[PDB]
Structure 1
Amino acid sequence: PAVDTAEQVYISSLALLKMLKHGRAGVPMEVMGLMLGEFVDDYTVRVIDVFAMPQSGTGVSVEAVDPVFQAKMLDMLKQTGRPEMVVGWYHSHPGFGCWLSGVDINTQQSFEALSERAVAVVVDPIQSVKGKVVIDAFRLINANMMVLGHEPRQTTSNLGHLNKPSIQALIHGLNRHYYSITINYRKNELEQKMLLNLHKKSWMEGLTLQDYSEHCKHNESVVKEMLELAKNYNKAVEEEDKMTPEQLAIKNVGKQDPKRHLEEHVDVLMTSNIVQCLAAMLDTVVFKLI
């Protein structure tokens, strides 16, 4: 019964944010926690929620799992509608990629003895940027099976080889002592609409008019900036006429481009004045005494 390469680990929206928040706050400690969820089948591992284990002391490494903290947190989470078993553990790798070290391999073996399908999720809060989180799910490769000449997992699909392994992970034992499980994200309409409220400006701000004294001064200063930029823009036009195509860009390094700054000033000023004008016009009839 070899595990399938098409196995997927599903991380909920709540779970992903908790490890990112816990991992970032614990930078650079390899802060660990337990992933609650359910092994739906031989091909799916759902991570409904996670919770963070405390750090026993100083040291940038994964500490031993505290059994009293785990058991009495699991017991107390069951009271508020979370009767979900532990499907693995997560820990942070603050900036040096997502892989498993020697200590991480030993920690995973503790989970593998209890649950054979335990998943080691590594999250990189430092390398994670907006729209792309550096995450990976790992499960150990048994040395006895692979040494004798057996692949760690069967490949009955194309699903598990869509993500090219990183060289940093391949260096640190990927595909040698552990394998990567493809991570898919479970997002619903409800949670997705709720997250859309982030940075949603209040209705008061839309109709609020900017101070006209500062608006005119900003109008004043930026227009004065184009006065010098236009003077420099004229020089840039003549200079580029008599100037070789190898220096079309090299000569632009270290020297400001009047054309680029003129566009930015025009773009900034056009939205500043149009919005102020439209907001003033809307407020004229919306807030009327008659």
Structure 2
Amino acid sequence: AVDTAEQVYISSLALLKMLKHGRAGVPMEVMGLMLGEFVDDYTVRVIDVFAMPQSGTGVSVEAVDPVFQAKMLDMLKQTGRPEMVVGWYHSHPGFGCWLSGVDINTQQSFEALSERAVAVVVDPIQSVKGKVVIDAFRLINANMMVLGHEPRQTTSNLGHLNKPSIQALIHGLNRHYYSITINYRKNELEQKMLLNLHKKSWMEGLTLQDYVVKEMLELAKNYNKAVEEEDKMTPEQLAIKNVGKQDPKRHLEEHVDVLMTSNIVQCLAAMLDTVVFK
């Protein structure tokens, strides 16, 4: 009846086992399970993610052991929070992380167990640092083809997620499926130390530790002189003369600005004499 676009709140702790357990299955595809709480129709949260045994014979719906979860939920009771299960996830490192033929067969089984059972995919390969990558989807019922086939209200959270549209075969699965919006509920307490732990460990280890003399400048002078004539022949090549040769051509970069910063490296590193000492 009434269906509203869902918003997925992921915890920074749940983001860990998505890429981490997925990295352990690389190259092969894994099968996980999502753990969280259903607040309402238009929003959903995943508060935890745990690792499930990887299948070396290929992913199947029987790869999830029911006594593995029954022993896990009991261990979650003695753990701080015993929250009910919600849905499943699987890695797909070998390709662009789209729902395979097994993923649709385990859909109607998991959506019978739990109401939503959001399908979540993840890939390591698409980037390293500055991209969300991952993936998510939710099955829209094929029996609804008799009814209105274009959910959801509050559109562009889908529509904008429908950008880039990610080639063809991916959105070729937009038949019988619709993706879901992933935003981050603020962990910033942990996220503030995530930046502090990362950059401090990357700043000279104490900031002190790190803080071929003339010879490095004799090797640099070959880049600061012998590179000049191959750079300064181009203005004489800009002289035609004049003018039979196709123009414009700009040879100014990148050596000029590199030798600039090359002195910026050597000047402030030589200031270590004046800085460290006295």
Fold match (TM-score > 0.5): yes
Render the CA deviation track for 1:138-169: whole Å, top value 9, x for unaligned.
Answer: 11121121266532434556565344153346
Bigger shift: 183-192 or 268-277? Answer: 268-277
- Report deviation, 1:137: 1.7
How has the CA–CA distance of structure 1 residues 105 and 279 changed in structure 2, closer, same or farther, with 3 Å as cutoff?
same
Bigger shift: 113-122 or 260-269? Answer: 260-269
Render the CA deviation track for 1:79-124: whole Å, top value 9, x for unaligned.
Answer: 2122211111111111522321111011122111122212111111
State how 1:1-290 maps to structure 2 within 5 Å.
2=1, 4=3, 6-59=5-58, 64-146=63-145, 150-155=149-154, 160-168=159-167, 170-171=169-170, 173-201=172-200, 222-224=212-214, 227=217, 232=222
Task: For 1:201 and 1:254, locate their aligned partners in 2 and report how far apart those are by CA, in whole Å.
Answer: 57
Task: For 1:231 and 1:225, locate their aligned partners in 2 and report how far apart those are by CA, in whole Å.
Answer: 9
Render the CA deviation track for 1:212-263: whole Å, top value 9, x for unaligned.
Answer: 9xxxxxxxxx454565566556767875788669999999999999999999
Task: For 1:206 and 1:28, locate their aligned partners in 2 and report how far apart those are by CA, in whole Å.
Answer: 33
- Report deviation, 1:48: 0.1
Question: Does the 8 Å contact 1:229/1:258 carry over to 2?
Answer: no
- Report deviation, 1:37: 0.8
Task: For 1:156 and 1:206, locate their aligned partners in 2 and report how far apart those are by CA, in whole Å.
Answer: 48
Identity of aligned residues (%): 100
How has the CA–CA distance of structure 1 residues 209 and 90 changed in structure 2, closer, same or farther, with 3 Å as cutoff?
closer
- Report deviation, 1:279: 11
How has the CA–CA distance of structure 1 residues 223 and 275 changed in structure 2, closer, same or farther, with 3 Å as cutoff?
closer
Bigger shift: 237-246 or 31-40? Answer: 237-246
- Report deviation, 1:56: 4.9
Question: Does the 8 Å contact 2:4/2:154 carry over to 1?
Answer: yes
How has the CA–CA distance of structure 1 residues 139 and 5 changed in structure 2, closer, same or farther, with 3 Å as cutoff?
same
Bigger shift: 155-164 or 260-269? Answer: 260-269
- Report deviation, 1:19: 1.0
Bigger shift: 247-256 or 179-188? Answer: 247-256
How has the CA–CA distance of structure 1 residues 238 and 20 changed in structure 2, closer, same or farther, with 3 Å as cutoff?
closer
How has the CA–CA distance of structure 1 residues 263 and 19 changed in structure 2, closer, same or farther, with 3 Å as cutoff?
same
Task: For 1:250 and 1:17, locate their aligned partners in 2 and report how far apart those are by CA, in whole Å.
Answer: 61
Question: Does the 8 Å contact 1:9/1:45 carry over to 2?
Answer: yes
TM-score where L is the length of structure 2: 0.72
Bigger shift: 145-154 or 265-274? Answer: 265-274
Task: For 2:2 and 2:241, locate their aligned partners in 1 and report how far apart those are by CA, in whole Å.
Answer: 58
Question: Does the 8 Å contact 2:28/2:94 carry over to 1?
Answer: no
Bigger shift: 77-86 or 143-152? Answer: 143-152
- Report deviation, 1:71: 1.8
Render the CA deviation track for 1:159-199: whole Å, top value 9, x for unaligned.
Answer: 65344153346446432021100111123232113323434
Question: Does the 8 Å contact 1:39/1:45 carry over to 2?
Answer: yes
Question: Does the 8 Å contact 1:8/1:181 carry over to 2?
Answer: yes
How has the CA–CA distance of structure 1 residues 266 and 14 changed in structure 2, closer, same or farther, with 3 Å as cutoff?
farther
The total of aligned residue pairs comes to: 278
- Report deviation, 1:75: 2.1
SS at match of 1:245: helix
TM-score where L is the length of structure 1: 0.70
- Report deviation, 1:14: 0.5
How has the CA–CA distance of structure 1 residues 174 and 201 changed in structure 2, closer, same or farther, with 3 Å as cutoff?
same
Structure 2 residue ranges without an equivalent (≥5): none
Structure 1 residue ranges without an equivalent (≥5): 213-221
SS at match of 2:119: strand
RMSD over aligned Cα, in angstroms? 6.2
Higher strand share: 1
Question: Does the 8 Å contact 2:126/2:133 carry over to 1?
Answer: yes
Question: Does the 8 Å contact 2:6/2:180 carry over to 1?
Answer: yes
Bigger shift: 102-111 or 12-21? Answer: 102-111
Task: For 1:126 and 1:251, locate their aligned partners in 2 and report how far apart those are by CA, in whole Å.
Answer: 51
